[PDB]
Symmetry: C2
Subunit: 230 residues, 2 copies
């Protein structure tokens, strides 16, 4: 039984250095929401240095719809930039995970999820699409023959249906146990009390802290952390 | 005897439409100095529509040196973005031509020319590097085994050594004859009166005008306009 741990990098924030020592996959910003070519270049090198799988963390450039075509184009632009930077160093970009609001909206909007999946596919069919467990992005991914991996969160509360409870409450290190529960037996205790089934193939480790202690403690609690090799 | 004509596009300016009807190669902006992913996406489609060779027009993001490493990284970022957008449409990016100040400075600074050439090579060794005739960029290109094409200008005055006279005077449609002279016999009458030898493998057509008349008139004057197939 293996589990993949991923962290967002290329934002210049937090300590990407130490976090790359305890994570199996990296999601590198592509210059829109954060980072730049030079930062992307240094993140890739550090990633290969630690044997971490290189992945892109594309983002968007009051819910005004941005046509799927535009998102598709902007996604290609970002992941193609990183893939080229990665290959220049003899590295290979292995996955793509949307960032923030793009990720959040693609989780519920089929059209947006579809746009992102198509872009990942158009870049390289062998790329693994990472998205929130049980969301539209996972659906879009498998819809196009893309290997897809579902993401779960250690510090977030889940509903009965298996999705997250809207931030706040929808307008403690119990996280460990929740994380261990999802990875080991694919289920999580919802805030409603009922058990909800989940895929949990990768857990997102927040490094923006001293929140680095939880990361290492999570691994101590853990069996075998490894990159997605589907 | 063939000649290649190129035009800068993806800047939203001028009439890229009509210019793509009389040019053999296109240099598409990559989102830094101008353009964006969507614009790049539409330019590529129009390029394949007119059978025009797709090329990148990367730029920089009081001559303060930007380390070659940075330029290298930023160049990869831009041309990799366009190459991915191009391939997504079943197209192929064929050449790279630096934009404005980056082009202007790489013409004289070996280190900068070297950085750009290495980036083009790291992206795809089969890419044609385009630079000012007799400049450092052409040298850097052939230095790395890259097919290189020298650019000449119809509306600019040349010196005896074969380089351009600094803008203004260095702090008429005679252009046609000058252009015909360079393409047909590889030489140009300098403002000093002496004949200067040049490679002239491609001429840059300014479409930012009614300067489109000169473009068509240049072709009327011309034999066989074709893309670089070295």
């Amino acid at each position: 039984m293996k589990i993949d741990l991923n962290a967002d990098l290329g934002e210049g924030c937090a300590s990407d250095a130490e976090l790359l020592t305890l994570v199996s996959s990296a999601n590198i910003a592509c210059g829109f929401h954060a980072g730049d070519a030079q930062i992307m270049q240094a993140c890739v090198r550090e990633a290969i240095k630690n044997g971490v799988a290189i992945g892109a963390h594309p983002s968007f450039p009051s819910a005004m719809q941005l046509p799927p075509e535009t998102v598709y184009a902007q996604t290609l632009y970002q992941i193609g930039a990183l893939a080229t930077i990665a290959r220049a160093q003899g590295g290979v970009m292995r996955h793509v995970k949307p960032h923030g609001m793009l990720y959040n909206q693609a989780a519920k909007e089929a059209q947006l999820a579809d746009a992102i999946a198509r872009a990942v596919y158009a870049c390289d069919p062998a790329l693994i699409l990472v998205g929130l467990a049980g969301s539209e992005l996972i659906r879009a991914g498998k819809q196009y023959g893309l290997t897809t991996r579902e993401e779960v969160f250690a510090d977030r509360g889940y509903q009965a249906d298996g999705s997250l409870v809207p931030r706040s409450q929808s307008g403690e290190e119990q996280a460990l146990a929740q994380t261990l529960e999802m990875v080991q037996h694919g289920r999580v205790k919802s805030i409603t009390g009922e058990w909800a089934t989940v895929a949990a193939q990768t857990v997102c480790l927040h490094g923006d802290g001293h929140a680095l202690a939880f990361a290492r403690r999570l691994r101590s609690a853990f069996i075998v952390v490894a990159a997605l090799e589907h």
